[PDB]
Structure formats: C-alpha cells, structure tokens
Amino acid sequence: ADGLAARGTFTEQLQAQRDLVKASDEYYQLADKRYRTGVDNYLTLLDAQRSLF
C-alpha cells in the first residue's frame, strides 16, 4: 500500500517538477536574449543559469 500510494502521487509530482524546469529554461533563454541584445550584462545571465541548475 505504501508503494501504491507513491506510484499514485509521483506522476503528478514529476509532472509539476518538469514544468518547473521548462519554465526556468524559458527564463534562461529570455535572459540570454536580453544579454545578446545588449540590455543586461554577464552578471545577470549567470544568476539565471544557477536557477536552471
């Protein structure tokens, strides 16, 4: 019954976790566009790479 409970909840846990990494990667790519254009510096892009990690 413990194994069945964990099988029941880890699917939505990992779904909500993979959506988090997708949103953090989108934030990283938007910050990289801001860095490539020339608005932000190389200190702000590294603060988004760490959130990805």
Cβ neighbour number for residue 53 with a 10 Å cutoff: 7
Residues in contact with other proteins, total (CB under 8 A)?
5
Q: Which is nearer to other proteins, 39 or 46 (CB)?
A: 39
Helix (H, G, I), strand (E, B) or coil at 38: coil
- 19-48: which residues touch other proteins (CB under 8 A)? 35, 38-41
Cβ(28)–Cβ(49) under 8 Å?
A: yes
Query: Least Å distance between CB 21 and other proteins?
Result: 27
Interface residues with other proteins (CB under 8 A) are 35, 38-41
